[PDB]
Amino acid sequence: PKLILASTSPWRRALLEKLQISFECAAPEVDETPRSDESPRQLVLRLAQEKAQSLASRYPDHLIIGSDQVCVLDGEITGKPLEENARLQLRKASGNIVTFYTGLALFNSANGHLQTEVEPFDVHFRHLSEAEIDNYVRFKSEGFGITLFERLEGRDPNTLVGLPLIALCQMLRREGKNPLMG
Amino acid sequence: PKLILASTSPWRRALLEKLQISFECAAPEVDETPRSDESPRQLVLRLAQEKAQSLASRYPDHLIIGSDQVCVLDGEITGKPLTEENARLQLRKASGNIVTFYTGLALFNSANGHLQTEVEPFDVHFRHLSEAEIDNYVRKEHPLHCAGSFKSEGFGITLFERLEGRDPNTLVGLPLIALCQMLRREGKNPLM
Q: What is the 3-state secondary structure (H, E, C) of chain A?
A: CEEEECCCCHHHHHHHHCCCCCEEECCCCCCCCCCCCCCHHHHHHHHHHHHHHCCCCCCCCEEEEEEEEEEEECCEEECCCCCHHHHHHHHHHCCCEEEEEEEEEEEECCCCCEEEEEEEEEEEECCCCHHHHHHHCCCCCCCHHHHHEEEEEECCHHHHHCCCHHHHHHHHHHCCCCHHHC
- Residue B43 CA to its chain's centroid (Å): 12
The span from the CA of A103 to the CA of A116, in Å, is: 7
Packing angle, helices A165-174 and A10-17, rounded to 10: 60
Q: Give the residue numbers in B contacting A (CB under 8 Å), as ranges.
A: 18-20, 132-133, 136-137, 140, 154-155, 157-163, 166-169, 176-177, 180, 189-192
**Out of B20, B155, B157, closest to residue A166 by CB:** B157
Q: What type of residue is A164?
A: P
Task: Please give the method by which this entry was determined.
Answer: X-ray
Q: Using an 8 Å Cβ cutoff, are A157 and A11 in contact?
A: no
Domains of chain B and any CATH numbers: 1-192 (3.90.950.10)
The dihedrals phi and psi of A146, each to the nearest 5 degrees, come to -55, -25
Interior CA angle at A20 toward B90 and A153, to 5°? 65
Q: Using an 8 Å Cβ cutoff, are A116 and A103 in contact?
A: yes
Task: Give the DSSP letter of residue B169.
Answer: H
The span from the CA of B137 to the CA of B87, in Å, is: 10
Residues of A in contact with B158 (CB under 8 A): 19, 169, 178-180
For residue B42, the surrounding DSSP H or E stretch is helix B40-53
The span from the CA of A22 to the CA of A33, in Å, is: 31
Residue B30, strand partner residues: none
Q: Give the residue numbers in A contacting B (CB under 8 Å), as ranges.
A: 18-20, 131-132, 135-136, 141, 143-144, 146-153, 155-158, 165-166, 169, 178-181
A141: closest chain B residue by CA? B168
Give start and end residues of each alpha helix (H) in B63-162.
84-94, 131-141
Q: Is B167's CB within 8 Å of A146's CB?
A: yes
For residue B180, the surrounding DSSP H or E stretch is helix B176-185
The dihedrals phi and psi of A67, each to the nearest 5 degrees, come to -150, 150
- Residue A58 CA to its chain's centroid (Å): 23
Q: What's the reported resolution, in angstroms, to a tenth?
A: 1.9
Q: Is B161's CB within 8 Å of A166's CB?
A: yes
The span from the CA of B45 to the CA of B66, in Å, is: 10
Q: Using an 8 Å Cβ cutoff, are A139 and A161 in contact?
A: no
Interior/surface letters A143-164, b for 16+ CB within 10 angstroms, e for the rest: ebebbbbbebebbbbbbbbbbb
The span from the CA of B185 to the CA of B179, in Å, is: 10
| End-to-end CA gap in chain B | 15
The residue length of chain A stands at 182
Q: Using an 8 Å Cβ cutoff, are A5 and A152 in contact?
A: no
Residues of A in contact with B169 (CB under 8 A): 146
Residues of B in contact with A155 (CB under 8 A): 162-163
Relative to beta strand A149-154, strand A2-5 is: unpaired
3-state secondary structure of B102: strand
3-state secondary structure of B107: strand
The dihedrals phi and psi of B63, each to the nearest 5 degrees, come to -100, 120
The span from the CA of A157 to the CA of A37, in Å, is: 29
